[PDB]
Design a protein around this ligand. Structure first.
Ligand SMILES: O=C(Cc1ccc(N2CCCCC2)cc1)Nc1n[nH]c2ccc(N3CCCS3(=O)=O)cc12
Length: 279
C-alpha cells in the first residue's frame, strides 16, 4: 500500500473514494478505490478472475486493518463526462452502436458466469482514446444514489432479481446517448417508478404476470397508458427502437438477454469508431 503514490482524487466512488495513483515500484498508473467481512473478501477475489476486454480489470486487492484497497486499471474518462461534452452536437450513431455492442459483450460475459453488475450508470462506464468502453464496479454490489437506471422489479421489491436488471439499465443508458437526456430521472423510488409507468404504461398481469403480487406493488398505483415508443427516443431508427423496447420489457423473463441482443439486426452494420477526447 505504501507502494502507491496518490496522483489525485478521481472522485467519490459508490463504496469510497477513488484515486488515480502511481505504483512506485512498477511505475504503472492505476485507479485506487479505498473501500472487513471475509465474505466480501472471497467475493471480490472471484472478481479478479472475471477478465474481459470490456470489463475494467481489477489488478489487485489489498486488505490491511479495516482498510480495503482495490486497484483497477485506469481509463481517462467516463461515459457521463463524455455525454455532457457532446450534448450540443450528439454522439454519432456509429459510436453509440459500437459502445452499446461492447457493453452487451461485457454483460454477456458476466452473466454467463452468473455475475450481475446491479448498478449500471454512465459514471461507471469508462472509455479510452481507442474507442473502447468498459464496465467498472462489476460485482461490488453483491460483495457489499441515483435511481435513474434501476429496473422496475428491484423498485417493486423483488429480492431475487436476475441479470435482466443490467439489460434494463443499459437500455436506459442507450436511450440517454440517443436523446441526450436521462430517460427516467426519478428523484425518489416512487417518483422513479411512476416516471417509468407514465412512459411504458402501468404494468399489469397481462404484460407482466405476477406483477400485482410483488412486495411493494399497490393496487392504488395510478393507471397510465403506454406512450407511443417513437416519442421516447426520436429519431432513432426502427432497428434501434425495436432493440430498445426489448431491453425495456417489464417482465424480467421476457426482457432480451445480452447474448440475444448481440444478434439483433441493429448491430448488422456495427463498426468500431474512435471518440475524440480532450484529456
Ligand atoms: O474515472 C475514471 C476517469 C477519470 C479520470 C480523471 C478524472 N479526474 C481526475 C482529477 C481531475 C478531475 C478529473 C475523473 C475521471 N477512470 C477509471 N479508471 N479505472 C477506474 C476504476 C474505478 C473507477 N470508479 C470511480 C467511482 C466509481 S468506479 O467505477 O469505482 C474509475 C476508474
Amino acid at each position: 500500500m505504501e507502494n502507491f503514490q496518490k496522483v489525485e482524487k478521481i472522485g467519490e466512488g459508490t463504496y469510497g473514494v477513488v484515486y488515480k495513483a502511481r505504483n512506485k515500484l512498477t511505475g504503472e498508473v492505476v485507479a485506487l478505490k479505498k473501500i472487513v467481512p471475509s465474505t466480501a473478501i472471497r467475493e471480490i477475489s472471484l472478481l479478479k478472475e472475471l477478465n474481459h476486454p470490456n470489463i475494467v480489470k481489477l489488478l489487485d486487492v489489498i486488505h490491511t486493518e479495516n482498510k480495503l484497497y482495490l486497484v483497477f486499471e485506469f481509463l481517462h474518462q467516463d461515459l457521463k463526462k463524455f455525454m455532457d461534452a457532446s450534448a450540443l452536437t450528439g454522439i454519432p450513431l456509429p459510436l453509440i452502436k459500437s459502445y452499446l455492442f461492447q457493453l452487451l459483450q461485457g454483460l454477456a460475459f458476466c452473466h454467463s458466469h452468473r455475475v450481475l453488475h446491479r448498478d449500471l450508470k454512465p459514471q461507471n462506464l469508462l472509455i479510452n482514446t481507442e474507442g473502447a468502453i468498459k464496465l467498472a464496479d462489476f460485482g461490488l454490489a453483491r460483495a457489499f444514489v441515483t435511481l435513474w437506471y434501476r429496473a422496475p422489479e428491484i423498485l417493486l421489491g423483488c429480492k431475487y432479481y436476475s441479470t435482466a436488471v443490467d439489460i434494463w439499465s443499459l437500455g436506459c443508458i442507450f436511450a440517454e446517448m440517443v436523446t441526450r437526456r436521462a430517460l427516467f430521472p426519478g428523484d425518489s423510488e416512487i417518483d422513479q417508478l411512476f416516471r417509468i409507468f407514465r412512459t411504458l404504461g402501468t404494468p399489469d398481469e397481462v404484460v407482466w404476470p405476477g406483477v400485482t403480487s410483488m412486495p411493494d406493488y399497490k393496487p392504488s398505483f395510478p393507471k397510465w397508458a403506454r406512450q407511443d415508443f417513437s416519442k421516447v427516443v426520436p429519431p432513432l431508427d426502427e432497428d434501434g427502437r425495436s432493440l430498445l423496447s426489448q431491453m425495456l420489457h417489464y417482465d424480467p423473463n421476457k426482457r432480451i438477454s445480452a447474448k440475444a441482443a448481440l444478434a439483433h439486426p441493429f448491430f448488422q452494420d456495427v463498426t468500431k469508431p474512435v471518440p475524440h477526447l480532450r484529456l
